[PDB]
Design an enzyme around this catalytic site. Sequence first.
Site, PDB file in Angstrom:
ATOM      1  N   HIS A  28       0.790  -1.229   0.000  1.00 47.39           N
ATOM      2  CA  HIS A  28       0.000   0.000   0.000  1.00 47.39           C
ATOM      3  C   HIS A  28       0.829   1.288   0.000  1.00 47.39           C
ATOM      4  O   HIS A  28       1.459   1.633   0.998  1.00 47.39           O
ATOM      5  CB  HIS A  28      -0.918  -0.025   1.224  1.00 47.39           C
ATOM      6  CG  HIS A  28      -1.642  -1.323   1.401  1.00 47.39           C
ATOM      7  ND1 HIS A  28      -0.997  -2.494   1.742  1.00 47.39           N
ATOM      8  CD2 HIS A  28      -2.949  -1.643   1.254  1.00 47.39           C
ATOM      9  CE1 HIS A  28      -1.877  -3.478   1.795  1.00 47.39           C
ATOM     10  NE2 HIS A  28      -3.069  -2.989   1.502  1.00 47.39           N
ATOM     11  N   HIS A 261      -4.772   3.101  -2.880  1.00 46.40           N
ATOM     12  CA  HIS A 261      -4.830   2.562  -1.525  1.00 46.40           C
ATOM     13  C   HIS A 261      -3.940   1.339  -1.325  1.00 46.40           C
ATOM     14  O   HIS A 261      -3.125   1.310  -0.408  1.00 46.40           O
ATOM     15  CB  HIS A 261      -6.257   2.159  -1.143  1.00 46.40           C
ATOM     16  CG  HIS A 261      -6.309   1.110  -0.072  1.00 46.40           C
ATOM     17  ND1 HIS A 261      -6.183   1.403   1.269  1.00 46.40           N
ATOM     18  CD2 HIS A 261      -6.376  -0.242  -0.156  1.00 46.40           C
ATOM     19  CE1 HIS A 261      -6.165   0.279   1.964  1.00 46.40           C
ATOM     20  NE2 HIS A 261      -6.281  -0.733   1.124  1.00 46.40           N
ATOM     21  N   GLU A 416     -15.707  -6.146  25.671  1.00 46.44           N
ATOM     22  CA  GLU A 416     -14.768  -7.261  25.632  1.00 46.44           C
ATOM     23  C   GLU A 416     -13.659  -7.088  24.604  1.00 46.44           C
ATOM     24  O   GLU A 416     -12.484  -7.289  24.909  1.00 46.44           O
ATOM     25  CB  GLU A 416     -15.479  -8.583  25.332  1.00 46.44           C
ATOM     26  CG  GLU A 416     -16.526  -9.002  26.339  1.00 46.44           C
ATOM     27  CD  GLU A 416     -17.862  -8.348  26.093  1.00 46.44           C
ATOM     28  OE1 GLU A 416     -18.023  -7.684  25.042  1.00 46.44           O
ATOM     29  OE2 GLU A 416     -18.755  -8.508  26.950  1.00 46.44           O
ATOM     30  N   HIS A 479     -25.974 -17.678  26.377  1.00 47.31           N
ATOM     31  CA  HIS A 479     -24.923 -17.506  27.387  1.00 47.31           C
ATOM     32  C   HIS A 479     -24.111 -18.775  27.638  1.00 47.31           C
ATOM     33  O   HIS A 479     -23.149 -18.751  28.404  1.00 47.31           O
ATOM     34  CB  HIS A 479     -25.527 -17.066  28.729  1.00 47.31           C
ATOM     35  CG  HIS A 479     -25.907 -15.618  28.785  1.00 47.31           C
ATOM     36  ND1 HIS A 479     -26.764 -15.037  27.876  1.00 47.31           N
ATOM     37  CD2 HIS A 479     -25.540 -14.631  29.638  1.00 47.31           C
ATOM     38  CE1 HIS A 479     -26.908 -13.756  28.162  1.00 47.31           C
ATOM     39  NE2 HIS A 479     -26.176 -13.484  29.228  1.00 47.31           N
TER      40      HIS A 479
HETATM   41  C1  THD Z   1     -22.597  -7.029  31.128  1.00 43.17           C
HETATM   42  C2  THD Z   1     -23.991  -7.540  31.156  1.00 43.17           C
HETATM   43  C3  THD Z   1     -25.085  -6.752  31.430  1.00 43.17           C
HETATM   44  C4  THD Z   1     -25.101  -5.265  31.735  1.00 43.17           C
HETATM   45  C5  THD Z   1     -26.405  -4.707  32.130  1.00 43.17           C
HETATM   46  O1  THD Z   1     -26.345  -3.307  31.841  1.00 43.17           O
HETATM   47  P1  THD Z   1     -27.481  -2.716  30.973  1.00 43.17           P
HETATM   48  O2  THD Z   1     -27.237  -1.326  31.298  1.00 43.17           O
HETATM   49  O3  THD Z   1     -27.512  -3.113  29.519  1.00 43.17           O
HETATM   50  O4  THD Z   1     -28.875  -2.835  31.767  1.00 43.17           O
HETATM   51  P2  THD Z   1     -29.591  -2.766  33.195  1.00 43.17           P
HETATM   52  O5  THD Z   1     -29.882  -1.324  33.148  1.00 43.17           O
HETATM   53  O6  THD Z   1     -30.787  -3.584  33.069  1.00 43.17           O
HETATM   54  O7  THD Z   1     -28.659  -3.287  34.234  1.00 43.17           O
HETATM   55  S1  THD Z   1     -26.507  -7.647  31.384  1.00 43.17           S
HETATM   56  C6  THD Z   1     -25.648  -9.089  31.017  1.00 43.17           C
HETATM   57  C7  THD Z   1     -26.013 -10.310  30.969  1.00 43.17           C
HETATM   58  O8  THD Z   1     -25.381 -11.385  30.849  1.00 43.17           O
HETATM   59  C8  THD Z   1     -27.463 -10.344  31.077  1.00 43.17           C
HETATM   60  O9  THD Z   1     -28.034 -10.797  29.855  1.00 43.17           O
HETATM   61  N1  THD Z   1     -24.267  -8.843  30.912  1.00 43.17           N
HETATM   62  C9  THD Z   1     -23.130  -9.846  30.514  1.00 43.17           C
HETATM   63  C10 THD Z   1     -22.834  -9.687  29.004  1.00 43.17           C
HETATM   64  C11 THD Z   1     -21.582  -9.356  28.552  1.00 43.17           C
HETATM   65  N2  THD Z   1     -21.268  -9.195  27.201  1.00 43.17           N
HETATM   66  C12 THD Z   1     -22.214  -9.365  26.254  1.00 43.17           C
HETATM   67  C13 THD Z   1     -21.842  -9.190  24.857  1.00 43.17           C
HETATM   68  N3  THD Z   1     -23.456  -9.684  26.590  1.00 43.17           N
HETATM   69  C14 THD Z   1     -23.819  -9.858  27.938  1.00 43.17           C
HETATM   70  N4  THD Z   1     -25.105 -10.181  28.139  1.00 43.17           N
HETATM   71  C1  THD Z   2     -11.087  -2.697   4.897  1.00 40.76           C
HETATM   72  C2  THD Z   2      -9.598  -2.615   4.826  1.00 40.76           C
HETATM   73  C3  THD Z   2      -8.906  -1.441   4.676  1.00 40.76           C
HETATM   74  C4  THD Z   2      -9.493  -0.048   4.568  1.00 40.76           C
HETATM   75  C5  THD Z   2      -8.552   1.021   4.197  1.00 40.76           C
HETATM   76  O1  THD Z   2      -9.128   2.229   4.695  1.00 40.76           O
HETATM   77  P1  THD Z   2      -8.279   3.063   5.675  1.00 40.76           P
HETATM   78  O2  THD Z   2      -9.060   4.261   5.585  1.00 40.76           O
HETATM   79  O3  THD Z   2      -8.033   2.487   7.044  1.00 40.76           O
HETATM   80  O4  THD Z   2      -6.982   3.619   4.892  1.00 40.76           O
HETATM   81  P2  THD Z   2      -6.406   4.194   3.502  1.00 40.76           P
HETATM   82  O5  THD Z   2      -6.675   5.591   3.805  1.00 40.76           O
HETATM   83  O6  THD Z   2      -4.979   3.905   3.511  1.00 40.76           O
HETATM   84  O7  THD Z   2      -7.113   3.547   2.368  1.00 40.76           O
HETATM   85  S1  THD Z   2      -7.239  -1.716   4.634  1.00 40.76           S
HETATM   86  C6  THD Z   2      -7.468  -3.410   4.794  1.00 40.76           C
HETATM   87  C7  THD Z   2      -6.669  -4.396   4.699  1.00 40.76           C
HETATM   88  O8  THD Z   2      -6.846  -5.637   4.671  1.00 40.76           O
HETATM   89  C8  THD Z   2      -5.320  -3.866   4.615  1.00 40.76           C
HETATM   90  O9  THD Z   2      -4.588  -4.220   5.772  1.00 40.76           O
HETATM   91  N1  THD Z   2      -8.829  -3.727   4.903  1.00 40.76           N
HETATM   92  C9  THD Z   2      -9.478  -5.127   5.136  1.00 40.76           C
HETATM   93  C10 THD Z   2      -9.736  -5.327   6.640  1.00 40.76           C
HETATM   94  C11 THD Z   2     -10.994  -5.615   7.106  1.00 40.76           C
HETATM   95  N2  THD Z   2     -11.289  -5.807   8.453  1.00 40.76           N
HETATM   96  C12 THD Z   2     -10.318  -5.716   9.384  1.00 40.76           C
HETATM   97  C13 THD Z   2     -10.672  -5.929  10.773  1.00 40.76           C
HETATM   98  N3  THD Z   2      -9.069  -5.436   9.037  1.00 40.76           N
HETATM   99  C14 THD Z   2      -8.726  -5.235   7.693  1.00 40.76           C
HETATM  100  N4  THD Z   2      -7.439  -4.966   7.488  1.00 40.76           N
END
Ligand code: THD
Ligand code: THD
EC number: 2.2.1.1
Lengths: 678, 678
Positions: A28, A261, A416, A479
């Site tokens: 690139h 690019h 995460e 879960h």
């Molecule tokens: C982190 C988490 C929750 C946070 C709750 O905050 P919220 O603000 O969305 O709502 P409340 O206001 O109701 O607390 S509810 C929950 C679970 O595992 C439950 O499904 N988990 C674990 C969890 C972690 N990561 C992902 C991707 N999904 C999840 N469900």
């Molecule tokens: C989608 C993509 C790029 C976009 C380029 O846009 P940019 O704006 O970050 O930069 P430029 O301004 O330089 O074009 S470069 C690239 C690759 O596979 C290259 O590593 N890929 C595929 C790609 C997709 N998804 C993820 C997670 N990583 C990647 N590298």
Amino acid sequence: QFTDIDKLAVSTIRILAVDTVSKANSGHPGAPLGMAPAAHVLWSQMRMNPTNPDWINRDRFVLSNGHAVALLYSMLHLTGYDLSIEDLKQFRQLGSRTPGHPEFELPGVEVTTGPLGQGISNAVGMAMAQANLAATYNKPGFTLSDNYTYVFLGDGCLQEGISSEASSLAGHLKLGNLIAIYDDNKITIDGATSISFDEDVAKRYEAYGWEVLYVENGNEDLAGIAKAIAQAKLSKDKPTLIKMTTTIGYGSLHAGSHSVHGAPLKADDVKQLKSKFGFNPDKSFVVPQEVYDHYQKTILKPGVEANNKWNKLFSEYQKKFPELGAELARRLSGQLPANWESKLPTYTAKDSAVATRKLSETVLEDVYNQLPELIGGSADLTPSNLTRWKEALDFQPPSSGSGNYSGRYIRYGIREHAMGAIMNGISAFGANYKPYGGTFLNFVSYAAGAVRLSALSGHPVIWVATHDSIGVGEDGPTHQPIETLAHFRSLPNIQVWRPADGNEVSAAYKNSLESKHTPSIIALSRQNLPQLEGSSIESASKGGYVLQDVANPDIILVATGSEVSLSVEAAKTLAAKNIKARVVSLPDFFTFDKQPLEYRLSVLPDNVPIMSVEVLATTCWGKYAHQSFGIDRFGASGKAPEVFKFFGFTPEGVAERAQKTIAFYKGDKLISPLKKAF
Amino acid sequence: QFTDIDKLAVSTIRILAVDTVSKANSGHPGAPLGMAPAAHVLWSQMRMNPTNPDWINRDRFVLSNGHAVALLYSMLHLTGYDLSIEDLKQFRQLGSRTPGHPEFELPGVEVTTGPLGQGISNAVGMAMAQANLAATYNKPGFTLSDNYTYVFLGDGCLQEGISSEASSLAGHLKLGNLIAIYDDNKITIDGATSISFDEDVAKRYEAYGWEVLYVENGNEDLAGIAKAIAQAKLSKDKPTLIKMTTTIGYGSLHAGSHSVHGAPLKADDVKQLKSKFGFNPDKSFVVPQEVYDHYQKTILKPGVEANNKWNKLFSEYQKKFPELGAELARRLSGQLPANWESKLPTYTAKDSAVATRKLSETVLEDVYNQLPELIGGSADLTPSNLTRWKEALDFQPPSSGSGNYSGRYIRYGIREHAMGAIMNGISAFGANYKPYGGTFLNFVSYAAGAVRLSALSGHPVIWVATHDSIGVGEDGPTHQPIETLAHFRSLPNIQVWRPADGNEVSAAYKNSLESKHTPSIIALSRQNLPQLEGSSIESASKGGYVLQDVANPDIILVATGSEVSLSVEAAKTLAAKNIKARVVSLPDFFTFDKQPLEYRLSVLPDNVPIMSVEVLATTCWGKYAHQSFGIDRFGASGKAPEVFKFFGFTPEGVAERAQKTIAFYKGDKLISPLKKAF
Ligand SMILES: CC1=C(CCOP(=O)(O)OP(=O)(O)O)S/C(=C(/O)CO)N1Cc1cnc(C)nc1N
Ligand SMILES: CC1=C(CCOP(=O)(O)OP(=O)(O)O)S/C(=C(/O)CO)N1Cc1cnc(C)nc1N
Ligand SMILES: [Ca+2]
Ligand SMILES: [Ca+2]
């Protein structure tokens, strides 16, 4: 105040990157050409030592838009790092030190990038580590830590959800030493950004609490770039994003087009580019002596002297603060405390039953004081993962009132993926940092992008993954992990621990923390499990061993985690039928596979049927067992005990399948699944 | 204008959800209590038919904060859906219709949620589908499509990167019929949001191009909630987010605390809650008759009549527009055109070699006109994935200038995860929508969270995953899949196609498109591959078959994709040594496993060594072969041909390992890896 030599350096960088890509006939050229001015200005004011890429207090640089690596390789070479023109001439070639995307292994490359969004997230972790190191070791008259964390990123990184997570958290954390330069060139692979990305980036970042600065002409305004960086350093209470507008492929006949690019510029395009910049169109990989001299004077010698002054300051610090000094010295040597493992909890069959989730909490409680480099956290599941020790202080901005930068527990929020990349950045910082992060095993999958780089780069990060199976119960299939372990067991260089009891949990932590180049996922249960008769840290540290032995067994039951105790009970049922079962515990495939073949075969020998038992996918068990009892469909929402029974995981259920396996192979010659033909 | 009956309905909802959680002694009472007022107001103005949950033009509701499902089950029951109080009394119990998190299978539940961030992303897809259906079928006097897409979400969803990706794209797309209500209660599992989430949500969403409205007192302001929704409908050019502040667990003695997030309220807390709302503290699962009467009059009967008028309108439409009418009628029946597969490309050994990536492009070009429900796209890799047909019109807002809502090609940008959830939403909308999305196989991993739900819920979405291996070459290890196929092959209910040639590519698309409840990942190569002698759509459609047969083979070479041709060449080398090798092609593990055991055994029989050949992890091959030749370490940056040779993947290399395998088993009795003991 930049002069002609600076303009010459910029042209040299641009052309060197272009030649590098052209010779490889792959790569690139776009971003390198567009970001060359910024690279020169930024690197020219960075405090680092090209002759010592590991200096702990060096300002750090991360190329989040990794495809622009030709620019990084050019800067590394031009400024004095151990990378030659020949190395650049081997760009993207099998076995060269210059791969198509930046790899952590190369000196001067702070982390592995290429997968968009990872770099900027890694940088957030680096800035967090710096903040903690400074808050932990700095003393009046002794500023051991105060480096900046610089990042280059493009539209691609800004679109990946992981960067939003990391940037939101970075803003909350008020990381004022984190400075990011956004290559605002309005082009991505599909064309103009307007077809899929027309959000107000500045407004979004200000919403996170970031300061946003601008550089309208990133193509030529060296002073403007320098001014933005200077201003960024003044806002110590906010991370800063510099929206620098540039023309992708600046200099090329097709600058501003998506065509520049990721494809080398055509020969004639390269020629006119060189002539345009006053270079000979018929020469390649040219570095004017004045450029080497310039960087020697402005970056290398000053960097060497800064490192020198720092070593002097640290030497005095160790005399002034013997304890803290020895502590940091130890950390910098990359070694844990001598006999630190002596603090790991040990158990016997007489101890009560405990969930491995709770056992994990106890290990953390017993070693956090012994390991000052240990930094924990959870993705909004602290009370569920049990990852926070009793008197912990949360890592937070001083103004929060919930902690300060000397804190060692991170509230990652429901992020995460960013947590994964942030841990990589903390680990990459150095000073033996040992970050660990908790979440439910099923959602570790949300961070696969980052976990993969942990394995590829070799960042020893630790995931405390609780609620490892249908044992979750009521929350249900969304879960309950099924494919999770099989997934990571198929990923090279990653430990996938699933401790069966107290001793195995300590072994998992022992191996995970002592690891220098391999990340770890420790799968933990919430249900109570008994302390196994036959388990020990020593044996479990081998990844696999004979838990319960018996002479001339009729079958070997190989299991993990919660199913080891189940298999022990199944063995009792089988014994009641005059059937002998040897029980093998396989805490970690990775660690087990590392043992000598001789040992592995002593655990899983020929001439005996082997049946695996684990409440998850069976897809990965062919390497150790002839038959497998697992779950290859999704879970169910119900009381845990009822769910296990639904799937047939009871002592009787295991025993019955063991009987079927025995009858299935009666009279046959069995070979250990471990034996390979090549 | 809401009256006392409305306030009574809100109390009924609150208490019913609480009782549901308490009886299960498991679940989340917090959000249900906090969002009850909004649920009543929203559902009371939604045009839907509880008696026909599949009515295509129904307004749709998505609970992105899935843990609050007790609220959804309460609304479904109270408003007339086929869900009884007894069902609620079996909340979170093994085999009940009311699992701990919402499942797509239940009528009235639009998608499976629980994993945070998925719901809102699914909703974006639903709104996109509605926009296309309307732009495609609506005619003067015939507004067949004009429904709204409503979503409830909390802080958790707002923190997951996937929602940022989806919201950024939704804003760019100007989806004015998408309305989201944010439960702004300042609490998450770790405590106050301020400890990890203090960004300016409103500012961020306005940056995406969303309109942001507010409801300060979401605990009681029924009129305000209603007004916000009404206002949202007026901004037809912007999706709208309503920041509704509420007190989590409103009514509970511990309202406002993180303690009421996910644990049933104590008995006495429930009692005072009921007394407080004028209910009998000693009775549970109580629905005042006036409430059923109210919903019958305000939601059920009006919904039934709206569905009735729509059926009348559509009947007339079919007479007015025979062609378009029959087309939509067909799609609503959930069936592809009769004999549509006749348009799939077919090849013979005489045809030239082609990369499966290009073959895929040709299939899309040959069927897009035949399949009006086909909606493609790419995550900023259109020119790399080759997913856009020649005369396609991009799906974009009319004001863009790049297309309009009748467009069938989506520019997802660098947002794999959101693309995965959006395709799920498009699929979930109905009208036989067939979304497919392209990206590099290695980055499909960035969307694992969504892909898992595609499998669990059974959304037949299609991933066009190009650059499937080290064949990628120069980009290196950060771009070369190793564990990817093994990962998804371990995930229940997902096809993982890796077509070897022209005919196999058509088989992959044939099976993927005809699929009603199973998603698909089609792994494609960039290197040219020859048209195999022995391949056919019919045979490949079985997932596994004998490509090249021979009487009494000395070994069976089972391979996939690019390694099938390699194995064919290896067989030539072996034949030159008087060694017979049967070649088996295994395009898709899933489809193959679906075939009768009799057929599978005819492909992988006993009494013959079986060696697998695939340039990726070998971890998943134990189910089909005795020995495996693959790659269980990361890739390398270099010219593709050189990388393959580095790993030993040449005809000679495969043949040699085949010889080793033969010698290894000489004299042994071999059993097909397919035979199970139970
Ligand atoms: C982190 C988490 C929750 C946070 C709750 O905050 P919220 O603000 O969305 O709502 P409340 O206001 O109701 O607390 S509810 C929950 C679970 O595992 C439950 O499904 N988990 C674990 C969890 C972690 N990561 C992902 C991707 N999904 C999840 N469900
Ligand atoms: C989608 C993509 C790029 C976009 C380029 O846009 P940019 O704006 O970050 O930069 P430029 O301004 O330089 O074009 S470069 C690239 C690759 O596979 C290259 O590593 N890929 C595929 C790609 C997709 N998804 C993820 C997670 N990583 C990647 N590298
Ligand atoms: Ca760009
Ligand atoms: Ca919330």
